[PDB]
A paper describes a structure:
The spike protein of the [name]-[name]-2 binds to human angiotensin-converting enzyme 2 (ACE2) through the receptor-binding domain (RBD) and changes the conformation to fuse the viral and cell membranes, mediating viral entry. Here, we used a structure-guided strategy to engineer an inhibitor peptide with mutation-tolerant and potent binding ability against all [name]-[name]-2 variants. We named the peptide CeSPIACE (COVID-19 eliminative Short-Peptide Inhibiting ACE2 binding). For engineering, we determined approximately 2 Å-resolution crystal structures of CeSPIACE or its intermediate-stage peptides complexed with the RBDs of several strains, including WT, Alpha, Delta, BA.2, BA.5, or XBB.1.5.
We identified a 39-mer peptide region that was easily chemically synthesized and modified it to improve structural stability and mutation tolerance. The high-resolution structures identified the roles of the peptide residues and provided information on which residues to modify and how to modify them. Y501 of the RBD is an essential residue after the Omicron strain, but it was N501 in the WT and Delta strains. The binding surface composing of G22 and L26 contributed to binding to both tyrosine and asparagine, whereas the previous A22 and M26 reduced the binding ability to Y501. Y501 binds more tightly on G22 and L26 than N501, which contributes to the nondissociation properties of the Alpha strain. K417 interacts with D30, but N417 does not, which increases the dissociation rate of strains such as Beta and Omicron.
Residue numbers in the entry:
A (entry chain A): 1 to 39
B (entry chain B): 333 to 530
The structure:
Amino acid sequence: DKEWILQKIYEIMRRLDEEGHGEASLRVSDLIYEFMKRD
Amino acid sequence: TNLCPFGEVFNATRFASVYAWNRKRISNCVADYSVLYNSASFSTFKCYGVSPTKLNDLCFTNVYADSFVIRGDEVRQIAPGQTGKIADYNYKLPDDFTGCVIAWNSNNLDSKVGGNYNYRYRLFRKSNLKPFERDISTEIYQAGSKPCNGVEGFNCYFPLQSYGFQPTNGVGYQPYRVVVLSFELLHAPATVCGSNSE
Ligand SMILES: *[C@@H]1O[C@H](CO)[C@@H](O[C@@H]2O[C@H](CO)[C@@H](O)[C@H](O)[C@H]2NC(C)=O)[C@H](O)[C@H]1NC(C)=O
């Protein structure tokens, strides 16, 4: 399953935002989207 | 007699978030689409039926103007047949769309030093939106094996994310205001006519 790695990527996205890495957070968001489309 | 109030849409001070996109019904007025086309510097102005000039000879029952803010690199998803985070979970055009999609860079209004958090998008959804469907729900999203019970936690996510627009972003990650014009033709007397109709 992808549960642990999905959580870690989610957590980096949220941390990158809080630290003002607003554009890096959006790059991680895109990955979350593509990752979750896969079986 | 009345000129269509496109200004209320295109020149609004604040735009909607894409997940909760705004729709304005335009009716009972005269529309000059060539003047609209020339009214500002647009980064996108793509019509899928006929051109602005040709629109000016046409009458419609109503015109719908949908508006919202997305990233510059997401404007390509506001088009028939596209998939992606925005097309799938936020705003979906039908395969047979024949209206216009208009967009312009709004970094000067919709970005903030330290991040603008006013604009959000949906990152998680169990299924893709149907064309012109609008989902404003905020249920915690179950990404894993266990139910969330309305509580954020492990693999249990709030479904919306902030864009966090900052003016220093690269242009693909800068905010863009988008207006989608839909041209409705019912079996009905027209109420929105182009400037050179008849
Ligand atoms: C949005 O606002 C701008 C600014 O007022 C409008 O542009 C003006 O339009 C009038 C009439 O066409 C002109 O006389 C002015 O010279 C224009 N000003 C500028 C700075 O271009 C614009 O028309 C509005 N957009 C819409 C769709 O109504």
